Amino acid sequence: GSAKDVKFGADARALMLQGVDLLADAVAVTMGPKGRTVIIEQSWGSPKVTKDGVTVAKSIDLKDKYKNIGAKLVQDVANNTNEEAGDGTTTATVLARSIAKEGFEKISKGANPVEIRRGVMLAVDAVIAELKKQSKPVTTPEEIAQVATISANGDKEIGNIISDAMKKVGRKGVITVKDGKTLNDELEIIEGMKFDRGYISPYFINTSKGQKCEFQDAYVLLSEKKISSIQSIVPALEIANAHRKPLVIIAEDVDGEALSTLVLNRLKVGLQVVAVKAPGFGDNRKNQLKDMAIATGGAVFGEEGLTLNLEDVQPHDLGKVGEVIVTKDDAMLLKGKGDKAQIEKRIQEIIEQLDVTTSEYEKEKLNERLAKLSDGVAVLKVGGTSDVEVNEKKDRVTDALNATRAAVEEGIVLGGGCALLRCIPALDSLTPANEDQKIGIEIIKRTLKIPAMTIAKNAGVEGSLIVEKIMQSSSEVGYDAMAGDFVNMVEKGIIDPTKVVRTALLDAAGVASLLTTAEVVVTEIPK
Amino acid sequence: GSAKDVKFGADARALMLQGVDLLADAVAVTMGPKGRTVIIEQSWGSPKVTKDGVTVAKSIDLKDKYKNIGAKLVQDVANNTNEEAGDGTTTATVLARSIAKEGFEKISKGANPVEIRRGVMLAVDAVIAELKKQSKPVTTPEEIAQVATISANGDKEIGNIISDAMKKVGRKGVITVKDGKTLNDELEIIEGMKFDRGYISPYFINTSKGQKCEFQDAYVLLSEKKISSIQSIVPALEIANAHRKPLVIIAEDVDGEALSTLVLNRLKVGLQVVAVKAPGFGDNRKNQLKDMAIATGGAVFGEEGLTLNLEDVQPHDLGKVGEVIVTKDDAMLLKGKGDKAQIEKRIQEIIEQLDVTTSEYEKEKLNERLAKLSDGVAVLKVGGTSDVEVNEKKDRVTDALNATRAAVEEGIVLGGGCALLRCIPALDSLTPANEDQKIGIEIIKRTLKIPAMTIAKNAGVEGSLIVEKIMQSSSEVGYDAMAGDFVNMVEKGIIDPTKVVRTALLDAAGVASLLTTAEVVVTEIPK
Amino acid sequence: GSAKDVKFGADARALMLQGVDLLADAVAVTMGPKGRTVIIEQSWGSPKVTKDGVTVAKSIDLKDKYKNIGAKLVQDVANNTNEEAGDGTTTATVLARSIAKEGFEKISKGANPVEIRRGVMLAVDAVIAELKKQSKPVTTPEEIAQVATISANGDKEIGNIISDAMKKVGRKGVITVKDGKTLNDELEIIEGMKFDRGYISPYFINTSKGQKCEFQDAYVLLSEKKISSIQSIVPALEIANAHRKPLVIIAEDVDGEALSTLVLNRLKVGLQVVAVKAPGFGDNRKNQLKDMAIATGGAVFGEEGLTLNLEDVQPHDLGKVGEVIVTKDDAMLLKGKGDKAQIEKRIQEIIEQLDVTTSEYEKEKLNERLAKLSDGVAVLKVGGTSDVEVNEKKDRVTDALNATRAAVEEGIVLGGGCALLRCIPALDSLTPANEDQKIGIEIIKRTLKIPAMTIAKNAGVEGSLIVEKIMQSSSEVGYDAMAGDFVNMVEKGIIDPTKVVRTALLDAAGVASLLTTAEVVVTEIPK
Numbered sequence A, B, C: 001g002s003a004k005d006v007k008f009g010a011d012a013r014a015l016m017l018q019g020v021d022l023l024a025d026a027v028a029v030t031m032g033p034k035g036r037t038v039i040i041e042q043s044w045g046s047p048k049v050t051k052d053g054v055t056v057a058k059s060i061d062l063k064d065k066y067k068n069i070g071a072k073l074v075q076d077v078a079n080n081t082n083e084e085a086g087d088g089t090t091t092a093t094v095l096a097r098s099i100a101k102e103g104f105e106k107i108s109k110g111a112n113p114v115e116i117r118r119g120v121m122l123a124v125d126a127v128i129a130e131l132k133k134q135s136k137p138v139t140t141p142e143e144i145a146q147v148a149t150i151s152a153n154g155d156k157e158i159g160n161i162i163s164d165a166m167k168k169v170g171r172k173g174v175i176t177v178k179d180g181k182t183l184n185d186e187l188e189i190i191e192g193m194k195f196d197r198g199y200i201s202p203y204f205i206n207t208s209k210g211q212k213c214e215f216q217d218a219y220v221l222l223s224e225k226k227i228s229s230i231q232s233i234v235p236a237l238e239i240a241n242a243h244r245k246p247l248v249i250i251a252e253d254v255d256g257e258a259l260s261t262l263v264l265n266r267l268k269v270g271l272q273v274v275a276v277k278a279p280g281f282g283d284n285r286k287n288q289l290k291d292m293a294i295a296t297g298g299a300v301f302g303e304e305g306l307t308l309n310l311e312d313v314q315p316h317d318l319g320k321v322g323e324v325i326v327t328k329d330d331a332m333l334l335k336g337k338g339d340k341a342q343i344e345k346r347i348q349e350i351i352e353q354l355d356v357t358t359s360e361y362e363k364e365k366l367n368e369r370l371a372k373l374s375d376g377v378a379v380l381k382v383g384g385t386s387d388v389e390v391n392e393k394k395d396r397v398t399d400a401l402n403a404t405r406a407a408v409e410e411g412i413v414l415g416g417g418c419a420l421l422r423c424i425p426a427l428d429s430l431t432p433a434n435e436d437q438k439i440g441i442e443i444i445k446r447t448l449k450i451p452a453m454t455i456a457k458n459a460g461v462e463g464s465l466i467v468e469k470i471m472q473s474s475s476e477v478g479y480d481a482m483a484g485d486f487v488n489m490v491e492k493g494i495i496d497p498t499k500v501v502r503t504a505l506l507d508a509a510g511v512a513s514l515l516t517t518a519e520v521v522v523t524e525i526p527k
């Protein structure tokens, strides 16, 4: 019901292209090894410094609504590329700008933009098939380090630390990025099963050097419900005392008279016992507790289904660990004596649960449980002098992790925009159905040179001459923009994930070729 | 009580025509195989790209009140056409603009616009009778595919997938359109009694590959009330254990001690049983429960009318399926061993309930129940790279589905505006009662050329020459605007459903001929 | 989603440099022995006068958002330097301005600012290594007084009183700064164990001169719970009456009939007894109570773990102190007769607790507990005529305290900016990898002269000539800006903590070299 302004044809298209051009010009300064950064004002505190294309894209909104429509569409391109691949958003932005500009130039009275878009999509499918033919699987960890180094803007230490993390926890393992309080990056490998619950009582500390409770060859008692009575905790303590063996109690909570019994027995006679709360806040807590039961060889007590009571506990119902460390904030179990076949069955059960989940949040929980049961987790702490530097480097570390995961999944192609450059002869062999599809194919053919030209332009050289000399070169030769030299790209480690390149192309082409079909733009009157 | 501005005669009509012309100019660029799109700004996020005439119409409101009145009236035209036919809104908009313009041109001192409107309505009735004589019923699925292809802007794959859906679930079957997460469209056919209710507890899973419960030749237990007590669930379990057959329990809820009994018997001894919540909220729950009871050959328990109790259950009161799948979110029953004649009696019951409903929401529920009982449901998932592309393609898929349903209902005529073009000699044989009705008949006669003119104009050719060459040709020959050729329209598949054509004409003519009777316009003073 | 302004290249960098220059110009007037003050308007009351660089930095926010971004970044530099070192914020601000200006001058088409930043960081690491080789540990308290005198802007009395405080309570002891109600500074040394809890009732006062309760060779009763009953309090009173010794009751609260028993026995027969509330709110109360029990040789009663009851108290369960003084607001225990080995064990327990905590709030609590158990606490009261003078002098006292702690931790270097001046030949021996890193090394090489030039400029002489004559001088000779002479800096006491110098350089360099990588600045449109 709001009053609207309606614009027609070339004027509306030119305003939308002005918005697209402003956003893409801001994004394009960040591309490549000699890309620069963008400072974004934040309303609350310090400004944000970033080389990340989607971050620059999402921060730009325009007062002019016709320009803002084009800005929102290229924002959609960058956001879709980021959600699908986690990298290549700057490439997607410059490809989308190129497709939008070439499509806007080709609209005449006799032109049919919908069939032009059909030609664009056919050419993009041909290029993606050529990219999949060009791709090679990742076999060596040196390739992993090269991919992570390229995606972290040439930082060899980030590539090395990501390669080390994937050596330790697996190429499909769990690696997380968090703030580091030091100046340098540090990799922490957490093995076994560590969770974020400390000791319930500080009296359980027996190693006063680190203010922690340490046992070797300890029994494990696992309860799905709270332990608060004398009769629910005394027989397990009798088993632990008669076997002369430490006991770790992990339950929902230990409180009331049971806690007083535990503290009294530890303080007076010196009974080796520690009580830890269970991790999780729902069915994840039950799943992790059953994972602990399988890994240690114990049984869950007070469960809803089997209904096993803590009054009648046998020595075979308790798990066995070789080492347990309980601090104020966390506890960790080492060398659980559970059956290996049962641990493998639980691992394949977690895998098959992962195959049927699409919530994108329970998948993280299942991957964490699988990592705790199988290989552990890696934590990358990013160093830096200040928070702005830490966030800027964290963006590149996240980009390198996403690119390395994508390269593990789908292989690698040539870096530096050369993979798209080598797909041009695949477009040269196509036969268009009509003139509009020929126009769309030629639009994509012109667009395929854009990433290499942008990388060369940010390096201070003439992009067109560089691109033509790459095209006259052999298929293994591209341009090192950092060195200013024409090199073997695979030998120098300038490589890109195939998934990132094809995602950027597809996400750019769909939105931009839809945008070039427009004849009328409707916007609200600014109030 | 607010202050008003009052305008008289030609100035008021010219302002109203300016509003009509603005909205119709924005709508008319989208018409036909070489129509273009309209981008509409959305306040909350990304803009909308559409070829849909009613969507463009509803987005445009004008600041000038007199222009906004004409815009509102043509919005009413497009909305009524969309609600009645689901297609043809652009044709209705351009026909309404033509009628409004030619009626405003013909108003003089001696003219009687009410009698002109009478002549318009008489001419429209004559054209609609000629359209019904021109119509031909749809006999082959190739015609179904051609109709869906034309209505999806020439997309042959949308036409093929709609034709496949109508082959599998019937031409009157239930077909729904929803988002797809892939690049391409998929047709999913859901057979049997499938409802969005999973298992109650995860201990019922016996097929760990997909995390699902799987039985074959299973008893089915249906309860209209909750099952919370031991004695309401034990005898059915005794029947299932004595016959050594699996049991599926469908009820409002299975909780408390009965759920504990089910989990205990599944875990300890291995009793094959699963419990699923009932679908529906209200009388729909008991209606689908009775549907499942008839389809499986069981009896609903705990009902208000017959009052069958769960403590006295016989083996013949339980349904018999040959197959059941229970997953986290859904449950589906296959090969229910119900009495067939009872199933057709329930089907005709649902049919006669459909004949006496007009709520437009319970009719959907009855159609879903009939599809579950008889032929299943089809789901079209629309692929795309981004949400704006998905919505744009979904608009055309919905248009093609509505047009195909209308073509199954009332037959097909020649497409490309030729069906209205061949109705001109029906107006040439009319005898008006007076001069005003002659004026109205001539208004409709001029308006009948407008859709073909607009289609040819959007293709970049002179529309009047195209229309005159069509009129000087034999009745089967029309203009292929996509190919730029004069072709046999039935042979080339350029066909339109008769319902859409007559709905667009009637909806345009009524509102526009009412608008052309106006002499005085009263608007509020803008604050 | 708000509208944004986007600026490119040299114009954006010039506006950001204007903001950086304004904030740094306001900060730089305060630098050195002839620095001047900045008056900051406060909204609620009297204005604030300060020589402190971070205080000046935080007060300045600019209306122009491009200038405000540079202002926020140098604010980050000053704040990070203040949080890490507590001193040297003006030096960090002028270093950051120098690095930002030199980096902005060096940006051209062929330059790579990220590699320039790499060269900057490598040069800064080389300078920090040279600084650590130049450092000398603090051995004499005369050096402590010299450090505190330099950091208090030449105030020898502040240096002397800080040196006296560190002589009394230790160089790692607890020293706090607060307001003084007199014209002059006073150092108060609080020995033993004093806490902010007075008498419960005023009837316990036996020394009427100061309205205080005084005992010598008194029993101590420590209770973790409230004492409100006759049976809880009478047996301890019988022990105290039979031994004819005074009793001090430290509990959570003493109320009800136990309190009336205490008052009645004090007033009628003259039983020597006093009751004092326990200090602390939480686990700190229990930890402090156990600290008093260990230091006095008593036992805590009414505890959660050991559960010692007050109805059965032996004479050995009571602490012994040679002196107790209970006033209206505080009570102190002196010459506690606890076992020295257990006090040492509790001290190492507190130390190992300090090693594993990073909360920055209860670390102060642990330091206070260690000071109470070991060496006492020092209170510096800052004298002054008015609150603005008191705050201005307190800023310098806090600066001198932080600088002295830093000098105890990491040693000292030459003051007057000469430590960075003598690190230039370490940069002259570096070999850059390329031209951009050479540019960064040269940026740091120019920046290393900035603090000495700023100190000389605030003293009214030409800074470049002074710096040239310092560099032509032998390594122990610098410029006494206060005396206007070239002197041996170590023997004149013009020395700086190494930690402060390296923290200022690193915190300036990281943020400013990140800032000089920017090409695009995005700000919101001002409303």
Ligand SMILES: Nc1ncnc2c1ncn2[C@@H]1O[C@H](COP(=O)(O)OP(=O)(O)OP(=O)(O)O)[C@@H](O)[C@H]1O
Pocket: A030, A031, A032, A033, A035, A051, A052, A053, A054, A086, A087, A088, A089, A090, A091, A092, A150, A151, A154, A399, A414, A415, A416, A417, A451, A455, A479, A480, A481, A482, A483, A494, A495, A496
């Ligand atoms: N030394 C180099 N020589 C040539 N090309 C290089 C070099 N290093 C990296 N590149 C190329 O630069 C591109 C990566 O640039 P950048 O990371 O800035 O953009 P992006 O991946 O498109 O976006 P974003 O990382 O912001 O999401 C890749 O095509 C990569 O191959």
Ligand SMILES: Nc1ncnc2c1ncn2[C@@H]1O[C@H](COP(=O)(O)OP(=O)(O)OP(=O)(O)O)[C@@H](O)[C@H]1O
Pocket: B030, B031, B032, B033, B035, B051, B052, B053, B054, B086, B087, B088, B089, B090, B091, B092, B150, B151, B154, B399, B414, B415, B416, B417, B451, B455, B479, B480, B481, B482, B483, B494, B495, B496
């Ligand atoms: N190849 C073709 N040649 C000629 N006419 C064609 C061709 N393809 C489709 N048409 C005609 O185009 C018209 C459909 O155009 P369009 O779908 O844009 O408008 P609409 O049905 O009036 O409105 P809407 O779909 O927006 O509700 C029909 O009259 C159809 O016969």
Ligand SMILES: Nc1ncnc2c1ncn2[C@@H]1O[C@H](COP(=O)(O)OP(=O)(O)OP(=O)(O)O)[C@@H](O)[C@H]1O
Pocket: C030, C031, C032, C033, C035, C051, C052, C053, C054, C086, C087, C088, C089, C090, C091, C092, C150, C151, C154, C399, C414, C415, C416, C417, C451, C455, C479, C480, C481, C482, C483, C494, C495, C496
């Ligand atoms: N008499 C002196 N001659 C030369 N330099 C001196 C003299 N006294 C102090 N300085 C130098 O002055 C500097 C301290 O100046 P100032 O305290 O104003 O700034 P800051 O320590 O950088 O910052 P802030 O105290 O505001 O956090 C040190 O480098 C110190 O060596």
Ligand SMILES: [K+]
Pocket: A030, A031, A032, A035, A051, A052, A053, A090
């Ligand atoms: K980038």
Ligand SMILES: [K+]
Pocket: B030, B031, B032, B035, B051, B052, B053, B090
């Ligand atoms: K249309």
Ligand SMILES: [K+]
Pocket: C030, C031, C032, C035, C051, C052, C053, C090
């Ligand atoms: K200062």
Ligand SMILES: [Mg+2]
Pocket: A087, A088, A151, A399
């Ligand atoms: Mg990248």
Ligand SMILES: [Mg+2]
Pocket: B087, B088, B151, B399
């Ligand atoms: Mg249509």
Ligand SMILES: [Mg+2]
Pocket: C087, C088, C089, C151, C399
């Ligand atoms: Mg200072």
